[PDB]
Every structure is written in structure tokens, then in C-alpha cells.
Design a protein around this ligand. Sequence first.
Ligand SMILES: Nc1ncnc2c1nc(Br)n2[C@@H]1O[C@H](COP(=O)(O)OP(=O)(O)O)[C@@H](O)[C@H]1O
Ligand SMILES: Nc1ncnc2c1nc(Br)n2[C@@H]1O[C@H](COP(=O)(O)OP(=O)(O)O)[C@@H](O)[C@H]1O
Ligand SMILES: [K+]
Ligand SMILES: [K+]
Ligand SMILES: [K+]
Ligand SMILES: [Mg+2]
Ligand SMILES: [Mg+2]
Ligand SMILES: [Mg+2]
Ligand SMILES: [Mg+2]
Lengths: 377, 377
Amino acid sequence: AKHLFTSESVSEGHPDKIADQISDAVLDAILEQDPKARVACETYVKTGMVLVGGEITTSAWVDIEEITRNTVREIGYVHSDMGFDANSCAVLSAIGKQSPDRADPLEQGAGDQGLMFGYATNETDVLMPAPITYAHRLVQRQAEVRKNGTLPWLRPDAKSQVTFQYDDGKIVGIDAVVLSTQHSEEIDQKSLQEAVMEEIIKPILPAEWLTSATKFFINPTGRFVIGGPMGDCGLTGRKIIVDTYGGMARHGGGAFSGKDPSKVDRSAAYAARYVAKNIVAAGLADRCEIQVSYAIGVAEPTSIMVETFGTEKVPSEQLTLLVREFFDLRPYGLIQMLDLLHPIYKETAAYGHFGREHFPWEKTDKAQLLRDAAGLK
Amino acid sequence: AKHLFTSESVSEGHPDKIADQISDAVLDAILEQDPKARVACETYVKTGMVLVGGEITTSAWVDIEEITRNTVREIGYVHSDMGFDANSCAVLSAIGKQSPDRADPLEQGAGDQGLMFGYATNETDVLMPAPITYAHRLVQRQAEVRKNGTLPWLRPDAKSQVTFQYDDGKIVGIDAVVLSTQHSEEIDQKSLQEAVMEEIIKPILPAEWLTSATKFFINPTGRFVIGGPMGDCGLTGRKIIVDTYGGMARHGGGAFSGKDPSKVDRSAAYAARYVAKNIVAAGLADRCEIQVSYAIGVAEPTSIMVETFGTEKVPSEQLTLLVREFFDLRPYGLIQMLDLLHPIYKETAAYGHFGREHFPWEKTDKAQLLRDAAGLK
Ligand SMILES: Nc1ncnc2c1nc(Br)n2[C@@H]1O[C@H](COP(=O)(O)OP(=O)(O)O)[C@@H](O)[C@H]1O
Ligand SMILES: Nc1ncnc2c1nc(Br)n2[C@@H]1O[C@H](COP(=O)(O)OP(=O)(O)O)[C@@H](O)[C@H]1O
Ligand SMILES: [K+]
Ligand SMILES: [K+]
Ligand SMILES: [K+]
Ligand SMILES: [Mg+2]
Ligand SMILES: [Mg+2]
Ligand SMILES: [Mg+2]
Ligand SMILES: [Mg+2]
């Protein structure tokens, strides 16, 4: 049935994402010294200032001020005319440090309760929904042409959104695309929307999807000139949907950035992306969403639920069997299943946690084994 | 098909929710003086401190420090032994104030882009999913027996989670229930889990749903004694799922609290709850989820999508017709459709935005008209 579905994305240097990036950049920096460190680092940016506030239990010593400034500079906020300067903004810390003091480590129970969801679909190359995939690809392309000198009047902040028309389950094409970019006072609007169209939109959106009818809204109000932390306000865990799946599938509360892998909010969600992506690569289903939950101090998950939406090639019973077979979903298990104690996390913080094939949770190594045990085909 | 589904909730005085409550309490306070005020107030709590940071364009003058402290005291954090004292904690403000300077006001375009989702189901009395409804009802009951002297060793912070087994679409019963409460040093654990069971769980969870098999986890690790902002960290818009629907239906990015109604993130989501709840009360479907999106400076929504999941009594075409008939979903329209410019928002901030029949978005006044035009039955 024809029906439209939208998803948004934002660039690095969008305030919420700056906060994400800084947090995860502190996590990485600690994890590189002490991989078993427990961190919970939350960040707040506002026009003059970054507050990095946390609870951290680690042996490591790391320079919060330096880490913050360096993250703000790669993003590009390096002069007051932009809105925010990495070299003169205030950086404040309120991170409580603690340094450290079952029979099977794998049986260690979950720290904090919760629910996590994971999804895959055969509708892109990357087993991700088409909307959030292109949505991210627009903002990433924006950062690219910004950063590579091609379109250098572009400044950091930027938001994209693409609405897809499906008739049923076939992505038929793109109804609308909106994109908004901070820019210098040097360029004009009509000059801008030529370049955004040629260099940013036209190379990313598949041309067959783009029609005579496609409503493009490039800078619709827009002379976007100051941006980033000037007059907006960034906090970690606010681009939670964008991080995930653009709202194609569901979500439990929970934020990723600034949480070390002992946090199920993160590692269980990553593990769920891994279990569904494996299910779909094996052809057990076309579309798969999984809910796993935990309760504090229990180690086995309190619930697993698979929804393959009429798209199975094996009954959901057998599916649920294989899920709780090939995958260790005890907190410490999924940490070991995906080899998580490594500084790989700042890369996660912008352009989306999933869909980007080089992350441990994006591997389809269990493809065949799942196929086999689910009645070889 | 038997399948389990979980949702969590948290009390007032859980740190994230404290932040929500303070923000919305500032919104209310401004809105009561200046209902047309535009606010975007974000809050961060950590052990000694509340930072209330914002952009606010209003004529009003309001005391951020007083408002914060008063909100912390109704919640109950009023002595250092709890973790946090309302009367001695630090309150910092970084709120930029601006005071103010189409032909039809209704045609004013949307400020910011985005997507919003709304849901209803005939599975509770309140047209809300059973999980998040009971989940909230546990924490609310906790606050009640805390506040009414009955169980006065209870302290503010508390989290609940309930997992329901459905066989298909029939809530068959409750597999597990977990509940964790901050308490005084006066009470013991075994004494605690008698009272939580008798006074909190047993009066809320329907007894037919509770079986011999129901795994109850009351304070599983738990001597929860200090809590709230001590050693956790609260930011607005982090209990985003809990706020909504416990993850039964989807979500766009976006947070409610501290946003005045011109913000589609809030008002469109509220409006969507209104359109679906009306659809289901009229019996056009059993379960209904709606996605509406906006693009900056356009006034009509860029996409509407209804999913009634095989549960219709009218084809989705006719449904989509009626939705974009009985409901004005232009930003200023939905503001007028639901009469939003009123200090009603601090009440929204804990125990869930939806399901609580006295909010403008919970009315089923359009029930019949929807029934009629969708072929009277
Ligand atoms: N001075 C101001 N007064 C009120 N709201 C403001 C503001 N300046 C801005 Br920018 N805002 C608005 O407040 C909203 C809240 O921020 P939000 O975090 O939702 O943006 P995003 O969704 O991109 O993260 C913004 O979408 C913006 O429209
Ligand atoms: N000192 C500490 N070191 C590291 N993490 C901490 C911490 N103290 C706490 Br409390 N945390 C953990 O960090 C996590 C991040 O907070 P979160 O906001 O997810 O809690 P909730 O989900 O209830 O809001 C918490 O769930 C908690 O387990
Ligand atoms: K959030
Ligand atoms: K975090
Ligand atoms: K807010
Ligand atoms: Mg934000
Ligand atoms: Mg969490
Ligand atoms: Mg939190
Ligand atoms: Mg938003």
C-alpha cells in the first residue's frame, strides 16, 4: 500500500551530537588506558561552555579539558563568527572518580534494568532501513564537502530528513527531502542551493528514486549563519532515534554515548542489532525486530521477543530457539561475543551507530550457522 | 502467539525525571505569565547541583532558583542523608532571555523539522498499552504510599518494569515484575519486600494476571539507601520512551519537557495521541499508530502514515482521508485544536504524558464524527 515514512539525521556539530561525541571521546580516552573502566559521562553544551559531568570508576588519568577542545576543533568550531570557538570556550568538569577496590564472570548479572530493541531489513545494501540510511548519508556528505575544501563556505551545523514512499515494502521512491546547512556570510542562498543540490543531494539520493515530483527543501527559511551551541543547547542521548534506525523500529529508553559496555542500554542494543542482522543475512526472515530486556542482578534476559512481520522462512518458535542459542545475551556474554572493551566508540557518535559495516555488531559471521540449524536451505 | 513484551517506568525523584519536572515547572511558571512565550529550557542535575539552561523569549520574569527548589522539595529531597537537599543544593542558571520585538496565523509554518508518532490500542481502559500503564501505576503507587505516611521509610527514587505475556493480542498475564525503591536505613530488606508486595504490587497488578509463575524481583541487589542525584545524573528528555508508550510503538527523536507548544516535537506528538485515540474509540480500528512529520517553514505536514495492523473496520485510504479531515495538523492548528497555551505541563512530567484522561490530547470528543464519516456503524 502506498504510505510515506520519514526519518531525520543531523551532522557532527549539531549541538546534541557535539555532546555525544565529547562523551564518547572521553570514554575512548579512558578505555584506551583502562579497558575495564566503568564510565557514565554526560555532557551539556550551551553558548560559552561545555560541562562534562560524570561518574567514572577507573585507574586512568585523562585530560577532560584537552579531550573536549580537541573534539570541538575536529568538528570545526574554531572562531566566534561560527557561534563557538574550541580554543576559547569554557570547559567545566564535574566527574566523580572512584578508583577500584559470581564464580563464572559470564554469570555476572545486569547492572540496571531495561529494554533494548534491534532491527534489520533486507531493504538496503547494509541491512538497514532506506530512510535513516540516506538521511545519514546526506549529512555525512555535507561534512565531507565541508571538510574537503570543495564547498568551504559550509559551516558545521546541519540537519537532513528524507521521506520515502513505499508500496508495500518496496521503496518506490523519495517524496521529499529537506536539508539545512550553516554557512558563511560569504555565500548567498540561491548560490547555496545550486551547490547543495549538485554536490550534496544529487550524488547521494538514487536517481531512479528522484522524480519530477520530489519536493526538495534546501535551507527553507534559511540563512543559517551562526549555529552549533549559539542559542541551541546540546545534551547527550538526545539524538537517540537518529542514532538507532530513524524510527523504523522501536527503542527502549536508552542512550549510548558516554556509557562503557557494562551498560546494557548500549551493549544489549548493539547485540540485538547483531542478532537481527545475522537472522536476515541467513534468509530466515526479511525484516526482524528483537526486544531483549534485563532485570538488575539477574544475568539471563527476562524476555526475548522476535517479530518477523509475516516475513519468516521458519516459525517464530524455531527462530526464538536459535536466537537464544547462537548468542550469549548475558551482559558479560554479549560483551565477549562482540569484543567490546576497546576504544572504538567516538566513531559511533555521529552518522549512526548501525549500518556502518566495520563495527563488531555489524558482522554477519553467524549467517550460515543460523541458516543450518534453522533447517538448511 | 505467546510472546513477551517489557516496558519500564521510574518515579518522580529518579534524576532524569527531576530534570524533566524542573524544566516543565519553569515552562508552566512562564506560561502562566505569558502564554505565548517561547521556551526551550534544558536541565542537568548532579550531586550538588541543578543547572537550568535555556533559551527563553518572553516578557515574563520568573525566579528560576525558587522554582527549582520548590520542585525538589515536593519530590521530597530535603536532607543530605537522602542524597540531595532542596534547601542547600546549588542552582545555576544559563538562560538566554530575549523579549519579543503569514496572513492566517494558522498557516504559520513549522519551527524545526521532524517526525512524531502516536498510538492507541483497545487493550486498556485508557486506550494505552497494558505494560507501560501498569509500569507507571507501580511507581505512582510507590510515590503515593511514600507521600501518604503509610510506608514512610520509602525515599524518592524508584524504578519499575513489568513484562507481559500476550498470546496474540490478548494480554494473557504477567511473567515478571521488578521494582526497586530507595529506602531509609531504618527498614530491612525482608521487611521491605513484604510491604512493597502488600501495599504497592498487590493492589495494582490485576490478580488474574498474577500467577504462581510470576517472577517478582523487589530490590534485587538492593539496599537502595542514597539515591536521586547522588552518583546518578539527570538530564531532560532522557526518559523519552517512558514518557510515551514503554516502547510498544515507535518514536521520533524528540523530547517534550521544557518545550513550549510551538515545538512540534511536543505538540504534534500530543496531537498524534489525540488522533489515534479518537480513531480507536470510534471503533475504526483496534490498534493505531500514526507518523506525522514536518519540514521547517512548511505548514502542512510533509507525511502522514496510519498503521492499523490488520485491525481496521474501514480501509486505510478512508482512514487517512478522515485523519487529514477532522484534525488540523498545521503547527498552529494543532495548538488551537487542543488549546495548549496554558500552564498544564508540570503534571505531564512524571507518570507519563498519555493515558491520563484529563489532558487535552486524551479527549475522545471526535469519536462519533469519525465513526459517521467513516461509514456509520
Ligand atoms: N531563543 C529560543 N527560544 C526558544 N526556543 C529556542 C530558541 N532558539 C532555539 Br534554536 N529554540 C528552539 O527550541 C527547540 C528545542 O531544541 P531541539 O533540541 O528540539 O532542536 P533539535 O530537535 O534539532 O535537537 C529547537 O528545535 C528550536 O526550534
Ligand atoms: N560511579 C559510577 N560509575 C559508572 N557508572 C555509574 C556510576 N554510578 C552509576 Br548510578 N552509574 C551507572 O551508569 C548508568 C547510566 O545512567 P542511566 O541514566 O542509564 O540510569 P537510568 O537508565 O535509570 O536513567 C546507570 O544506569 C548506572 O548503572
Ligand atoms: K533521549
Ligand atoms: K550517557
Ligand atoms: K527540552
Ligand atoms: Mg536537542
Ligand atoms: Mg538506562
Ligand atoms: Mg539517565
Ligand atoms: Mg527536536
